[PDB]
Each structure stands twice: as C-alpha cells, then as structure tokens.
Ligand binder design. Structure first.
Ligand SMILES: NC(=O)c1ccc[n+]([C@@H]2O[C@H](COP(=O)([O-])OP(=O)(O)OC[C@H]3O[C@@H](n4cnc5c(N)ncnc54)[C@H](OP(=O)(O)O)[C@@H]3O)[C@@H](O)[C@H]2O)c1
Ligand SMILES: O=C(O)CNC(=O)[C@@H]1CSCN2CN1C(=O)CC[C@H]2C(=O)O
Ligand SMILES: [Cl-]
Length: 273
C-alpha cells in the first residue's frame, strides 16, 4: 500500500493538501498534527466530506515524536512514498516581539524542525517517491536583501547541509548580539528560515541524485502564494484549496518524470534561485 503524509495537516494549507491527496493519491494519506485533538477534528472534517485520511501525531520540534512516526511508517508501510513538509510558523505583520526572539522561535521550527523530519524520513522514501518542502516567496525578498557574500553562499551549488546549519545558527546568534545588519543579514527572520528551507531542499535533491541515482525520486521546494489561513489573514489572495495546488502538483509528479528536481517552484513553474 502506497502512503503519503503531510506535516501541519490540521488546518491551513496542510489540511487542503491532505484533502487533495485523499481525492487523488493512489494509496493511504496520513494527516499529521502536533495536537492530537486538532488532528482528529480535522480527520472528522474530511470524513464529513466523504474522505478517509489516516492520522498520526507529529510535533516536528520533538525528535522523539519524529522517530515514533518513522518507526510507524517502517512497521505499517515499509517506508514512505510522498512527504509534504508543510508545518511552519511566523509572527504577525508588525508584531512587536523583539527581532532576536522572532529569529530564535521561527528558526527552531521552520528550519531545524523541518530538517529533523528530513533527516529521519528521507531514508524511508521509496523509488518514484516525491518530497515537497513548503517554503515562501518571502525567501526571495530575504535573499535579495542579503550582502553579496551571503547571496553567493546561499546560491552555491556545492554548499553542504553542515555549512547551511552554520549559516542558520549564525543568523540567530547575530540577531542576539545586535550585529545582524553589519553581518549582511536581511531583516525578516521568517524569510531567513525560508532561505534555509529552500537551500536545504537544493542540498537534499543533490544528495538524492548522487546517492540514489535510478530511484526516480523528485524533491522540490515550493511557494504556495499568499493564502487565507491563520498565518496570514482574510485579505490574502488565495483560498487554502488554491494554496495547495503547487504542493499537490509536486507531490503527484508522474512516475519516471525527470523533473522538476531540486527546484524552487511557484504556480507550478520553476523560479531561478
Ligand atoms: N500566505 C500564507 O499562508 C503562506 C505563504 C507562503 C508560505 N506559507 C507556508 O505554508 C505552510 C503552511 O502555513 P499556513 O498558512 O497553512 O499556516 P497555519 O494555518 O498557521 O498552519 C500551520 C500548520 O503548521 C503546524 N505547525 C506549526 N508548528 C508545528 C510543529 N512544531 N509541529 C507540527 N506542526 C506544526 C500548525 O499546527 P497547530 O494548529 O498545532 O499550530 C498548523 O497545522 C507554512 O510552512 C508557511 O510558512 C504560508
Ligand atoms: O510586512 C512585513 O514586513 C511583515 N509581515 C510578514 O511578512 C507576514 C508574516 S506571516 C509569514 N509570511 C509573510 N507575511 C504574510 O503576511 C504573508 C504570509 C507569509 C508568507 O508569505 O510566507
Ligand atoms: Cl509564497
């Protein structure tokens, strides 16, 4: 039995991705959520629409929670076909929380939590599997505002995961020390975490090509657009159903497709990083 899984599945874009996968994906779809009550309520919402998602708890900030999910997927399915890393957090527009606190809080979940899910679950991905990391067009605004030296580092085709980890930790520590402008950083803390998600996706796509050549796995970062969810607000352009389109596209690329792979994709089109 084939299996697809979405992180941060109880609301927002992640719930919409789950719904579309329940309609389209040939196999089981696992809705995950950090809070069991909110995950179960979202499964009941989808069951009221005629769909049958499975549920498993997952808090991407708890490595034990990630490992419990890893063990469940190995036991029940022998691995994983589709992984959508959707979970993320942000501060509201004009939120008065100090910039160094926004940096530490956003970085912990959006970069290091997503990275731990990839560390634990990438080895489970089966041939013809797809992995989708939900990034944001805020990563482009952040990248363009970096110093030219940071832009070169973040665009490099040879950067390692450990080098990227050093940069993400350096951003957080530079905000605490009050030196992030002199050190070449932009001034959106969420946007730097999404630079991290985009570059992590590039590194992981290169690793899959080098080490799993022939297994036909495709891994991409994506931008869902501005979507009416609790992260954003009712002015946002897209419904959750519309925001889900590009992630669903990337999750369901036909077997044997040669790409996109390692791309940063918006409205189903590759953007130059
Ligand atoms: N305009 C937009 O909405 C927009 C634009 C570009 C990119 N994005 C990206 O789209 C993705 C979905 O965001 P959204 O707009 O749908 O936001 P949302 O409505 O706030 O949903 C975020 C989801 O992530 C979950 N989450 C947060 N921290 C988690 C953790 N530690 N472990 C597991 N799940 C966690 C939330 O769970 P709880 O219910 O427990 O909080 C919720 O299920 C995020 O990566 C976001 O950066 C959004
Ligand atoms: O206007 C600003 O500089 C501050 N606010 C934001 O960028 C705002 C925080 S929520 C995270 N993202 C960017 N913001 C949004 O409202 C759009 C949703 C989200 C995104 O585009 O990724
Ligand atoms: Cl976006």
């Amino acid at each position: 039995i084939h299996v697809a899984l979405v992180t941060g599945g109880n609301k927002g874009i992640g719930l919409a991705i789950v719904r579309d996968l329940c309609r389209l994906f040939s196999g089981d779809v696992v809705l995950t959520a950090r809070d069991v009550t909110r995950g179960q309520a979202a499964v009941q919402q989808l069951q009221a629409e005629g769909l049958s998602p499975r549920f498993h708890q997952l808090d991407i900030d708890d490595l034990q929670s990630i490992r419990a999910l890893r063990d469940f997927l190995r036991k029940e399915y022998g691995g994983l076909d589709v992984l959508v890393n959707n979970a993320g957090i942000a501060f509201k527009v004009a939120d008065p929380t100090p910039f160094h606190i926004q940096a530490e809080v956003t970085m912990k979940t959006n970069f290091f939590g997503t990275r731990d899910v990839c560390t634990e679950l990438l080895p489970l991905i089966k041939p013809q599997g797809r992995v989708v990391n939900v990034s944001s067009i805020m990563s482009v605004r952040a990248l363009k505002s970096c110093s030219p030296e940071l832009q070169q580092k973040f665009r490099s085709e040879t950067i390692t995961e450990e080098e990227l980890v050093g940069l993400m930790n350096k951003f957080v520590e530079d905000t605490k020390k009050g030196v992030h402008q002199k050190e070449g950083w932009p001034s959106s803390a969420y946007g730097v975490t999404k630079i991290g998600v985009t570059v992590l996706s590039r590194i992981h796509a290169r690793k899959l090509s080098e080490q799993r050549k022939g297994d036909k796995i495709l891994l991409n970062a994506c931008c869902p657009g501005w979507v009416r969810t609790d992260m954003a607000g009712p002015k946002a352009t897209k419904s959750p159903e519309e925001g889900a389109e590009t992630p669903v596209y990337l999750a369901l690329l036909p077997p044997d497709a040669e790409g996109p792979h390692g791309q940063f994709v918006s409205e189903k089109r590759v953007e130059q990083w």
